[model samples]
Target: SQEILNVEGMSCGHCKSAVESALNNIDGVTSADVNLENGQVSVQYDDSKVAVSQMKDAIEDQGYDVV
Candidate 1:
């Protein structure tokens, strides 16, 4: 399933890359698309293999706030 959450504070190309790369580091994650205009991220992964909280923290650790 694809989950879209508001991940705030991304202001550059690296910020976009950082968010996607961070998400891909986790297991079972297939895709992570970020929308810079609103700072919303659409992530697609196996929900059974990874928890949403885990994904949230994944980005948070890299310095983005998820809501």
Candidate 2:
């Protein structure tokens, strides 16, 4: 499955890296890309292995609001 997460508080390369790493650490996430230009993170994962709420929590843990 794929999800486009709209997040706030990302303003730099570091923010992008943080979000990317956080998603990558999750068990089911195959890939995560943060677009600094749009404040969006595109994620691809296996729904059978993880839930969307987990993805949101991961972003929240990084200090960003996934909206």
Candidate 3:
């Protein structure tokens, strides 16, 4: 499934890459895209292997808030 998360405190290309990489690190994650202007992160993953709460945790681990 695909989940779109509202992210806070992302401010640059580096931030974009950081957020994307964080989500992709999860075992079941297929892809992660960050929209700078919209402050949103779109994530694609296999729900059987991962949970939505885990995804949010990954983003928060990177020093950003997922709302």
Candidate 4:
């Protein structure tokens, strides 16, 4: 499934990339795109292999907010 994540504290391209990097590191994650301007992220992955809460926690660990 696709997830539209609302993120906070993303201030630049580097921040966006960092967030994307973190999300992409997850084992089940297929892809991640972060929009710094809107503080939104679109993530694509296999639902059976990953939980939404795990995804959210991964992003939070990178020093950002996920809601």
Candidate 5:
């Protein structure tokens, strides 16, 4: 299933882009969209390759949080 994550602390387009790039770099993620204004990340990935926690961790690694 796809994961719709509620992330906080994304203040600018750079933040969104950062998250998008990071997510896309992950092995499992097939697609991802991030809204800096809404502070949310919508991700589609193969569960066999990655989990929701890894997705969250990817964002957190950029100094953000999964709300």
Candidate 6:
């Protein structure tokens, strides 16, 4: 499944890479994409293997907020 999440307090490119790598690091995450202009992230992953909250937590771990 693919999820478009609204992340808060995200710096531009640095935060972008952080979020991308973090989400992509997940076992089930096929891809993680971030849009700074719109302030949203699109993640595609296997729902059964990874939960949304888990992804959210990963983003937070990078010092970002997912809301």
lDDT of each: 0.91, 0.95, 0.93, 0.89, 0.88, 0.91
Candidate 3: residue 51 Cα off by (Å): 0.6
| Cα displacement (Å) at residue 66, model 1 | 0.9
Per-residue accuracy of model 6 over 1-67 as CA lDDT, tens digit each: 9999999978788889989999999999999989998879999999999999999999999988778
Model 1, which residues run further than 4 Å from truth? none
Poorest lDDT segment (10 consecutive residues) of candidate 3: 58-67
- Which window of 10 residues has the lowest lDDT sum in candidate 2? 46-55
Q: How far out, in Å, is residue 52 in model 1? A: 0.6
lDDT of 5 at 24: 88
Summed over model 5, clashes come to: 0
Which parts of model 2 have CA positions greater than 4 angstroms off?
A: none
Q: What is candidate 5's lDDT per residue for 1-67, written digit by digit as tens?
A: 5899999898988888899989988998999999777877899999999988888888899899888
Using TM-score as the measure, the top candidate is 2
- Candidate ranking (lDDT, best to worst): 2, 3, 1, 6, 4, 5
Estimate the overall C-alpha local distance difference test score of candidate 6: 0.91
Q: Which regions of candidate 3 deviate over 4 angstroms?
A: none
Residue pairs in candidate 3 whose N, alpha carbon or C atoms collide under 3 angstroms = none
Can you list the residue pairs that collide in candidate 1? Answer: none
- Residue 48 local lDDT, model 6: 91
**Top lDDT prediction, candidate number:** 2
Instruction: Output the TM-score of candidate 6.
Output: 0.94
lDDT of model number 1: 0.91
Residue 61, candidate 4: alpha-carbon lDDT:
94
Could you list the CA RMSD of all candidates, in the order they appear?
A: 0.7, 0.6, 0.6, 0.8, 1.0, 0.8
lDDT of 4: 0.89
